[PDB]
Design a binder for these strands. Structure first.
Lengths: 178, 61, 325, 51
RNA sequence: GAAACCAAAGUCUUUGGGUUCCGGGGGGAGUAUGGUUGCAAAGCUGAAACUUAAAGGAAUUGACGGAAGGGCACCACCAGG
């Protein structure tokens, strides 16, 4: 039998304590995997057992808990267990453009939008879920949809105002057999 | 090979003009194999279909 | 008719510049892009509205002018007059649904046929769709004439106008009898195979798109509907056109076919389905271009103050208020 | 050395020839704009009318 | 306080704590010319003639979005007569 452990940072502990029953239940019910949380090592330790139905169910679980730890909502992350092709392509915000201080803060700002509107609008059009950790952009969706989303997010951080960005991406969505 | 079908649930209307009905298909081959298919015409819950190809699966995701 | 032949060119072309970018073009913009004469263009516009050249629009805030159906027609004929193709007007006119046929005569006196596209969404889009129609039709007209086809000869295209060779006759739909039905049938059947050889299917090859010249020669017109042979239903549109002619000659002239052409030949012919260093002379030109742009920008802002309609509405209510007090 | 040093000194001489040539054009356009400014302002005062 | 805003941008027609620089409708123009500094590129200082009823700052409704979501119509479509 084999195992995979994934870390959890201190800012993500209290959600992992709250949502714990919503996390371990789908891991243990229809996947049939042993799961515990090592408080010493601060890792979610998941295992195979005798009750494990199939191989790669371990990998389904690994991706699920990873998604939750990155910041994705449990209901959204659950999709990784059921669906085949969903990926979390993540990149630093400073990968696209070298930005310092106040410029980076405005940069984060316009990915999000006022009331998080821009963030949600891309999530709608690209059929993805995006998460902004302070200086990281984690996106979750289909591969074609990720490559779409990474471009819109990217344009926003290298300047292009939200108004131009929506116009570009809605044309791209129309061609991709959506 | 020709396989007969059931209707488990009528989901919604697909198609350009709203002509196609998206329908949950149970098999009459005893298997609980639930494949979602698109039908042309009027289909109510409890209909029995004649699918030409059973290997096909309609627009999921 | 065309009497005025100076300022009318510049003003009407200036409308066409604004028509490509925006809907209704304001009178402020017109004079700036027609800088040759200043001030006296507003009386020219009042002469243009006398004819069906331009239409006035004062809805709520939008104040200006848009080009009409007939006004767009005059612009092409004015360009064809400078190319020495059109001089006088022939009166034999076949008014259709998609296009109008006008007889034109040159300097020589030789009569030619002119096609004017009348597509009839706002009128701005309708006069842009007619532009793409003529450029597409002239493209096929050049492509077929060069490749031995019995089509009218392409001469010149201007925006929506197409000048063609004058083939005078009657359409196949209004023909009672043909002296030799068999020879005409075999001629028409060859032309479907001819197009298929060049990788083309007519699509709507009927009796409504064929003209006989003295009951000897079959002439083909109207080409915006043509499709490629790479299409999945290539043989279907091929067979439908064959059966349309097969039945027609059996219906009208009572001729039964002995030859049944159903050959797929792609492609033995051309694929037509695709169809100190800087000299002072330069310094002068560059300085001139800078100085004109500074003057043109200032004239725009002077013309933008024309609002005259806003001042007229405000004055009417003030007279009513003072009298009632 | 001598190979790189001569190659760099050739590019220095190209740029020195270049900004002399750029300054010469900057005075040529400045002298031509100023005389065309007068010849346009001349029309405003006189030689513009009807009769 | 025109105001967004500002515990300073407050203690201003109930106007004076000391003190330096600096703006006077917009352009022309931060241009010419002179001086000076600079190897150069340039920097500092720095006009006029002439032209123009405006150039602008704050706030506010939303005619129009080639913006997005809904909803409806055989004077729309779909399956048809």
């Amino acid at each position: 039998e084999e195992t995979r452990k994934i870390p959890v940072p201190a800012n993500r502990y209290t959600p992992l304590k709250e949502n714990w029953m919503k996390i371990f239940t789908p891991i243990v019910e229809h996947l049939g995997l042993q799961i515990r949380f090592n408080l010493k090592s601060r890792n979610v330790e998941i295992r195979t057992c005798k009750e494990t139905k199939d191989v790669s169910a371990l990998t389904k679980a690994a991706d699920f808990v990873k998604a939750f730890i990155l910041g994705f909502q449990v209901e959204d992350a659950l999709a990784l267990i059921r669906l085949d092709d969903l990926f979390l392509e993540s990149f630093e915000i400073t990968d696209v453009k070298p930005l310092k201080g106040d410029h980076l803060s405005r940069a984060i700002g316009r990915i999000a939008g006022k009331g998080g509107k821009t963030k949600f609008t891309i999530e709608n059009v690209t059929r993805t879920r995006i998460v902004l950790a302070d200086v990281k952009v984690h996106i979750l969706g289909s591969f074609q949809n990720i490559k779409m989303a990474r471009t819109a997010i990217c344009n926003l951080i290298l300047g292009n105002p939200p108004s131009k960005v929506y116009g570009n991406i809605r044309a791209v969505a129309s061609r991709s057999a959506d | 090979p020709i396989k007969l079908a059931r209707v488990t649930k009528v989901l919604g209307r697909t198609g350009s003009q709203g002509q196609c009905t998206q329908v949950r298909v149970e098999f009459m081959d005893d298997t609980s194999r639930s494949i979602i298919r698109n039908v042309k015409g009027p289909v109510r819950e409890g209909d029995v279909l004649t699918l030409l190809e059973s290997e096909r699966e309609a627009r999921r995701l | 008719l065309r009497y005025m032949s100076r300022d009318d060119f510049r003003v009407l072309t200036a409308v066409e510049m604004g028509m490509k970018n925006h809907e209704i073009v304001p009178g402020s913009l017109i004079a700036s892009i027609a800088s040759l004469k200043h001030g006296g263009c507003n009386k020219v516009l009042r002469e243009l509205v006398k004819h069906k050249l331009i239409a006035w629009e004062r809805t709520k805030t939008v104040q200006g002018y848009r080009l009409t159906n007939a006004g767009y027609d005059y612009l092409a004929l004015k360009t064809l007059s400078s190319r020495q193709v059109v001089e006088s007007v022939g009166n034999q006119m076949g008014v259709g649904k998609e296009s109008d046929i006008y007889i034109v005569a040159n300097e020589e006196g030789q009569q030619f046929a002119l096609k004017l596209h009348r597509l009839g969404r706002h009128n701005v889009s309708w006069l842009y769709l007619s532009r793409l129609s003529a450029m597409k039709e002239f493209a096929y007209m050049k492509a077929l004439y060069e490749r031995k086809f019995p089509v009218p000869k392409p001469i010149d295209y201007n925006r929506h106008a197409v000048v063609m060779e004058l083939i005078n006759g009657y359409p196949l739909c209004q023909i009672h009898h043909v002296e030799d039905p068999a020879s005409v049938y075999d001629e028409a059947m060859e032309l479907i195979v001819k197009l298929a050889n060049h990788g083309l299917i007519h699509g709507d090859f009927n009796e409504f798109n064929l003209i006989l010249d003295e009951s000897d020669h079959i002439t083909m017109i109207d080409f915006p509907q043509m499709v490629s042979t790479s299409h999945p239903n290539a043989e279907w549109y091929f067979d439908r056109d064959v059966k349309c002619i097969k039945d027609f000659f059996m219906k009208r002239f009572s001729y039964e076919s002995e030859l049944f052409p159903t050959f797929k030949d792609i492609r033995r012919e051309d694929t037509l389905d695709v169809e100190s260093t800087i000299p002072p002379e330069l310094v002068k030109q560059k300085v001139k271009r800078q100085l004109t742009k500074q003057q043109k920008s200032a004239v725009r802002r002077r013309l933008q103050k024309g609002a005259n309609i806003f001042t007229k509405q405000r004055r009417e209510n003030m007279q009513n208020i003072k009298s009632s007090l | 050395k001598e190979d790189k040093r001569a190659r760099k000194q050739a590019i220095k001489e190209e740029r020195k020839e270049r900004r002399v040539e750029k300054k010469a054009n900057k005075l040529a356009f400045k002298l031509e704009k100023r005389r065309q400014e007068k010849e346009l302002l001349n029309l405003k005062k006189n030689v513009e009318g009807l009769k």
